[PDB]
């Protein structure tokens, strides 16, 4: 399997967006933040269990997204903290 090539990182101007949540201390090893454009290709990211927020970008203007936040201990995901927002 050929590795990806030509990695480039550069500044870009767009709207940023933050998600906040509450959770018991030392309860989860990590948090699964699975978001996707409503009725569309989903993005699954994983932050450390000590985090209580994460910021998003690269979202299409004038549409709707759906976000589910899971509490993960080991590999066991808790119940989804779900929501939907308009960009």
Asked whether 39 and 83 are in contact (CB, 8 A), the reply is no
Measured from the CB atom, is 39 or 55 closer to its own copies? 55
**11 is a contact residue toward its own copies (CB under 8 A):** yes
Measured from the CB atom, is 22 or 62 closer to its own copies? 22
Q: Distances from the Cα of 34 to the Cαs of 2, 3, 9, 53, in angstroms?
A: 27, 25, 23, 14
Binding mask 56-85 for its own copies (x = CB under 8 A): xxx--------x-xxx-x--xxxxxxxx-x
* Angle of CA points 53, 33, 60, to nearest 5°: 90
**26 is a contact residue toward its own copies (CB under 8 A):** no
Residues found near its own copies in the complex (CB under 8 A): 1-24, 27-28, 31, 41-48, 50, 53-58, 67, 69-71, 73, 76-83, 85
């Amino acid at each position: 399997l050929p590795a990806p090539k030509n990695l480039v990182v550069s500044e870009v101007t767009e709207d940023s967006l933050r998600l906040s949540w509450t959770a018991p201390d030392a309860a989860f090893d990590s948090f699964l933040i699975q978001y996707q454009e409503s009725e569309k290709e989903a993005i699954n990211l994983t932050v450390p269990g000590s985090e209580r927020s994460y910021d998003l970008t690269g979202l299409k203007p004038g549409t709707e997204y759906t976000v589910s936040i899971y509490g993960v201990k080991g590999g066991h995901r808790s119940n989804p903290l779900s929501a939907e927002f308009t960009t």
